[PDB]
Ligand binder design. Structure first.
Ligand SMILES: OC[C@H]1O[C@H](OC[C@H]2O[C@H](O[C@H]3[C@H](O)[C@@H](O)[C@@H](O)O[C@@H]3CO)[C@H](O)[C@@H](O)[C@@H]2O)[C@H](O)[C@@H](O)[C@@H]1O
Ligand SMILES: OC[C@H]1O[C@H](OC[C@H]2O[C@H](O[C@H]3[C@H](O)[C@@H](O)[C@@H](O)O[C@@H]3CO)[C@H](O)[C@@H](O)[C@@H]2O)[C@H](O)[C@@H](O)[C@@H]1O
Ligand SMILES: OC[C@H]1O[C@H](OC[C@H]2O[C@H](O[C@H]3[C@H](O)[C@@H](O)[C@H](O)O[C@@H]3CO)[C@H](O)[C@@H](O)[C@@H]2O)[C@H](O)[C@@H](O)[C@@H]1O
Ligand SMILES: OC[C@H]1O[C@H](OC[C@H]2O[C@H](O[C@H]3[C@H](O)[C@@H](O)[C@H](O)O[C@@H]3CO)[C@H](O)[C@@H](O)[C@@H]2O)[C@H](O)[C@@H](O)[C@@H]1O
Ligand SMILES: [Ca+2]
Lengths: 450, 442
């Protein structure tokens, strides 16, 4: 089966909930740092779920109708990939009630919620793992993990399987039916609590049999539940109809940034790469691709562009033009900067004198265009290099067409005649300024059903 | 009628004391460093060789005509106090340098309009100094309006001047001898190769004189351009007997009202531009010299309080208009300054001190105009789409163009609603915050 239809109309906003908005400082830990502080692998700022709720207007005004939240279950770190209880919201984020309140406010606003499924590993603080450290071969949980022997040690190197050699992330034994049962109950439990899908953390470290079983458990609750795989390389293995509905499209990230920030690839090579990527994605999964320019595991877009906001805007035009659901990383829309993790996990400033609001408005415009034109959501995609510095992303539905034209040089003209996919447009020539974009579509009119 | 070539023109205004100093041997002894604050009294040593040396800049902007502020021998840095109308100012160069500038301009297809300062001359001019000295016995006593002798500036001048200023004695244009001198100035520089004259404070003289002036200039050649300085309605100058057009200070005020001040909205801008258009007679639209700033105003970017994107809106509108657009030296690279003397800063030639994206934006608007024939000869219609959004539609014989300018936070334009454009265009077009879009259709 294919990606749910609603993905075609989605626009995602990615939130790292430690850092979004601190609405309830009674939930703050003892050594919470000031909100403007430099992020580190160890510090806590107090972001909470009530802060998400309180800022839904910002998210909707951006043009997003879906959230992707990084992990929110009880954990010991600020990133919460080291979960200790998969059936509890972390105590610093809030309670189950607050979570319920976010899901309800989201439903009321037509916002969907995707959570992070961290199934390959848990934290060393997890009850099961703590029980194995204490009770060893007599623990009921000994084979929920891959412990070489006793006593459990981390002191040189771990004597147990982990995420990439990290001591505090012991690897779940997914070959144990009891672990798979726990894992599927997590899936099912949060779906019962109102979520609309799951993003699969490091799914390439588990195995496809398990991911097939996960699909059946999720899609059995509802076929409109979205599953999206983290995948940094070719997405193709995830799109066979038996695992995910799409991947995080890091392929398109690298292509786009190669052109707009690095200067390493020209428009021909960008066009070729995006068309080839498109052709490799099976029919029915293009809409399920989760397109992005950055995340909590990359430097921030504006830092990749060395502070060139106009160049950054070319990446956003491209992002919003592509088939698949575009996703903005929280604070990128107001021009936050940062190097790679932890640098990109800065706290979101809510004092609007610190925002680049021309950047914000640029992105809103792209989003609004996409929201208004059916072809930008459901059209086939063709990328067309016009010259080394200029690319057209054409989205076509029937005889209808939308075009986002992206120019990284000092100005140009585009003859829409003599570029065949651009043919139905009435404009015969369109100018582009320095680092300019132009967005055009054929006259569209909603058709009457009676 | 205005000469046809004005339709394809794009002017670059130079205040020659400040453009480029190529020849240090012409610098005065009191010459200040090129980075200095401009003042009513200081000289920076700009010269004509400096102009010649940067002609490639002017061409690369997309300009093909120069308006020079006065260049004749004078005692001030602005040179409106001419002391000899038949000589280039010694600090600027020689008649040979001027010839060379004309020839290098011709080679590149650049026309030259000079400033005609006929209402008054400087107190240093030979005729006026002859009057101070020889008084009633001077042959030139009636070339001026001197009340009595001895001539004095001291409390107030005892002679007629430009607006009370003692070093700008008023020429007596009622004297046939003076008119003869004036007409000989006009003729002389046309014989040296110029393409037209800009008229300084033409409202201080009289239309009779200005009709004699047109007859003398057009008699040399019908294609020589005459443009009046006029800050209010241009219509007196457009009856076919004086100028080919004016400096379009009306459209300056309307455009900046919308893009910089926020006092006028798109509907008012449109209406004002369509009315201006309707008031300008047929044959004279092309002759209007459109501008956003001059040596007599604050710099466009200062009017915009440093908002480069807002400024770019002003240039989009400027270059869309019927009439010849004019860029004021250094605005293209984003020089700032208050009004005179603050708008008369030295032009920087280090490319790292330029706002090159501003430069490139302007170049783009220029290129579009240069490429599309309707942007030069097409009928003009302005239409407001929104309080913040305006379309300037130019209609050619075989092609229509629109420049859409938005001063808001972003919008969508249904091209079927601009009915001037809409019989061969139903595309929708997006505009970003402070965005423009430029399109053409066969
Ligand atoms: O192979 C993954 C990584 O494991 C160790 O680093 C621990 C990191 O844990 C988190 O990283 C998650 C990402 O944010 C996810 O989006 C995805 O890639 O999966 C990982 C693990 O769940 C945490 O967010 C990071 O701050 C930690 O560095 C190794 O030390 C790394 O070398 C490995 O690449
Ligand atoms: O009436 C005009 C003005 O006269 C006196 O100021 C002397 C100014 O002389 C020059 O200004 C000229 C402009 O730059 C021209 O483009 C046009 O407007 O004509 C005038 C006079 O030839 C000089 O460039 C300026 O720096 C001087 O101020 C009065 O003092 C002013 O109040 C009058 O408005
Ligand atoms: O998630 C944190 C991490 O993200 C990036 O690294 C991604 C990812 O790269 C490798 O994984 C590859 C697997 O080894 C292959 O078997 C699989 O086919 O393709 C994946 C990627 O899709 C690493 O092996 C893995 O540890 C890591 O998650 C950043 O590059 C990295 O610096 C971050 O630490
Ligand atoms: O020229 C420098 C000067 O420029 C501006 O002033 C222009 C101009 O304005 C007035 O002239 C008007 C006449 O009085 C009217 O009779 C005529 O119809 O219209 C003109 C305007 O076109 C002043 O009288 C005149 O002295 C001046 O040149 C700036 O406002 C001014 O501050 C500058 O000094
Ligand atoms: Ca000099």
């Amino acid at each position: 089966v294919t990606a749910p239809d609603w993905l075609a109309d989605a626009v995602f906003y990615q939130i790292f909930p430690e850092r979004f908005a601190n609405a309830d400082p009674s939930l703050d830990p003892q050594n919470v740092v000031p909100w403007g502080s430099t992020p580190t692998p160890d510090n806590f700022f107090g972001g909470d779920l009530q802060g998400i709720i309180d800022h839904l207007d910002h998210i909707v005004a951006l043009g997003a109708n879906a959230l992707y939240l990084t992990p929110i279950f009880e954990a010991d770190t600020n990133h919460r990939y080291d979960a200790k209880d998969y059936f509890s919201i972390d105590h610093r984020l809030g309670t189950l009630e607050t979570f319920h309140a976010l899901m309800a406010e989201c439903r009321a606003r037509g916002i969907r919620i995707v959570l992070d499924a961290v199934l390959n590993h848990c934290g060393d603080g997890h009850w099961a793992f703590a029980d194995v450290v204490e009770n060893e071969a007599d623990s009921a949980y000994v084979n929920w993990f891959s412990v070489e022997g006793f006593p459990v040690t981390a002191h040189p190197t771990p004597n147990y399987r982990t995420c990439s050699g990290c001591y505090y992330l012991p690897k779940w034994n997914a070959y144990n039916p009891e672990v798979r049962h726990h894992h599927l109950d997590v899936a099912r439990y949060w779906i019962d609590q109102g979520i609309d899908g799951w993003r699969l953390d490091v799914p390439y470290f588990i195995n496809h049999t398990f991911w097939r079983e996960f699909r059946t458990a999720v899609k059995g609750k509802s076929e409109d539940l979205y599953i999206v795989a983290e995948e940094w390389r070719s997405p193709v293995e995830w799109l066979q109809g038996d695992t995910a509905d799409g991947t995080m499209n890091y392929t398109a990230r690298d292509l786009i940034l190669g052109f707009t920030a690095d200067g390493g690839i020209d428009a021909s090579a960008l066009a070729a790469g995006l068309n080839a990527l498109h052709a490799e994605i099976p029919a029915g999964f293009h809409r399920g691709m989760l397109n992005l320019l950055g995340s909590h595991d990359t430097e921030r877009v504006l830092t990749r562009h060395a502070g060139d906001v106009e160049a950054a805007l070319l990446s956003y035009a491209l992002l919003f033009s592509l088939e698949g659901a575009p996703m903005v990383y929280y604070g990128d829309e107001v021009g936050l900067t940062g190097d790679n993790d932890p640098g990109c996990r800065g706290a979101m400033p809510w004092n609007e004198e610190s925002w680049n609001t021309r950047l914000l408005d640029g992105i809103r415009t792209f989003a609004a265009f996409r929201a208004h034109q059916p072809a930008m959501r459901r059209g086939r995609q063709t990328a067309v290099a016009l010259d080394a510095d200029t690319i057209a992303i054409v989205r076509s539905g029937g005889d209808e067409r939308a075009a986002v034209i992206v120019h990284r040089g000092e100005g140009t003209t585009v003859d829409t005649a003599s570029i065949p996919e651009l043919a139905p447009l009435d404009a015969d020539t369109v100018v582009l300024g320095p680092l300019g974009t132009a967005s055009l579509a054929t006259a569209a009119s909603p058709g009457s059903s009676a």
